[PDB]
Design a protein around this nucleic acid. Structure first.
Length: 49
DNA sequence: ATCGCACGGGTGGATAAGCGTTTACAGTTTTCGCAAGCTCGTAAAAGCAGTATAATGGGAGCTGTCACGGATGCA
């Protein structure tokens, strides 16, 4: 996979809703990763590595 | 021819026993030969204590992403 930023989604991870959760993701050549993501309350979250 | 029969001589035959001669199958004596084991000696291996300018908090390349259920365990 090429480095850079990459946006995707999931279809049916939370089965009790049926909603779509979008996530952003920065991928470097060398270093830590950095994900942004949504949750079924429409809040924005961050997990590093 | 031709041939037995007999008295008797010579023997062959069956054990048996004889003779001097050169090695067995019994048992010990002798010497020589080389070890396997013990004792030893020391040069090598093995182990131990110390070294006084000053020195004071890792991360160390890890993980790169699969997704589905059950039980667990806080809240």
């Amino acid at each position: 996979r090429s480095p850079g930023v990459f946006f995707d989604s999931d279809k049916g991870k939370t089965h009790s809703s049926g909603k779509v959760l979008y996530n952003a993701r920065i991928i470097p050549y060398r270093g830590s990763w950095l994900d942004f993501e949504f949750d079924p309350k429409d809040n924005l979250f961050v997990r590093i590595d």
